[PDB]
Amino acid sequence: TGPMRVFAIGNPILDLVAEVPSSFLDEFFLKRGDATLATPEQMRIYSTLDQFNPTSLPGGSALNSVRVVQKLLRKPGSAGYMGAIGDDPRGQVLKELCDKEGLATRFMVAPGQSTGVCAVLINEKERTLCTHLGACGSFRLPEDWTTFASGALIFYATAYTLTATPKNALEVAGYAHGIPNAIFTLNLSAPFCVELYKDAMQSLLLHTNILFGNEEEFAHLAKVHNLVAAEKTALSTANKEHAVEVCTGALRLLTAGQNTSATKLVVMTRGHNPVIAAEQTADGTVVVHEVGVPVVAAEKIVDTNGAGDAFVGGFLYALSQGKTVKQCIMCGNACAQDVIQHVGFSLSFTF
Ligand SMILES: CSc1ncnc2c1ncn2[C@@H]1O[C@H](CO)[C@@H](O)[C@H]1O
Ligand SMILES: CSc1ncnc2c1ncn2[C@@H]1O[C@H](CO)[C@@H](O)[C@H]1O
Ligand SMILES: [Cl-]
Ligand code: NA
Ligand code: NA
């Protein structure tokens, strides 16, 4: 029963994992290896998936990250989460899976809508995702969320939550803004979030303490907000120099040129390359961090999906333990490394 160390909002989704024939991907016009939102002609994909013996597992980006936090903290209610679900069987299945892990949650029910669902299709060593948000889009942060989250100083939201309404993440970040030890953290989530919610994200970033994102997301952020010269907008982030310039430019979106005692940090994951981060220190000087990623044979990599969510989960767990920025990144790396070496988006039992 607490204490709650991290509170997050997200799109609660039930992942349906199953191996399928290539004719399946072809029949539903899917391209192997891509993650997309279900099209009108793919609405029967979930019911059709049933004939392939699907495994139901809790999903959703933010939910995956807080489950990592909860697993590491162990005490029931160590992490809290809010999102919306439907009034269907699938919603009950998701809620049960979360309760047994000890996560503190409050799922808002949307009558008549279906709980978020993601088809994780395994074919030819690749993962193809097809997501249908459903009820997730109806989520509206309840007025008493601060009471539900009592005690937590670390708040987290994915840019994916902007698809319901950017007001949810703005309200959470607004609560943390100005309070020196209150930390709001955000994930860029996907390239389309950066473009589609340009202005809402710009405002949200001013209220952000820590920003997480991968290379592709940051490249889009840099282009939309003109963080670097047009001549550099296409340079490879696999180049330390360019990655650092992008991170340093993005940091300005959080600092607005001002300096307080509050945390202001941008973290860029770069696949197998070292994680790069730009941090505004106590006196306002900017310091760059480079944390190498432990090598892992390509033969031991099962799937990179979920690595990002696990990384964030680890980072936040470490942060709640008061670890340094480098230590937080290393923990995120350890969690990400565990998840990519086996089926599923959760940490191994033995971890
Ligand atoms: C706004 S679209 C969206 N929002 C939040 N999470 C998403 C979305 N699409 C897929 N997922 C989740 O990504 C997890 C793997 O990273 C998978 O668990 C999958 O459920
Ligand atoms: C050979 S590919 C590879 N090798 C080792 N680790 C990987 C790799 N790809 C991703 N990671 C880990 O996932 C984090 C980003 O989610 C990355 O920051 C990193 O921690
Ligand atoms: Cl999410
Ligand atoms: Na500072
Ligand atoms: Na995995």
UniProtKB/Swiss-Prot annotation:
Keyword annotations from UniProtKB, A to Z: ATP-binding, Kinase, Magnesium, Metal-binding, Nucleotide-binding, Purine salvage, Transferase
Protein name listed in UniProt: Adenosine kinase
Organism: Toxoplasma gondii
Principal EC category: transferase
Family under the similarity heading: Belongs to the carbohydrate kinase PfkB family.
Protein residues bound to Mg(2+): A176, I179, A182
Lineage, opening ranks: Eukaryota, Sar, Alveolata, Apicomplexa, Conoidasida
Cofactor comment text: Binds 1 Mg(2+) ion per subunit.
GO BP term, pick one: AMP salvage
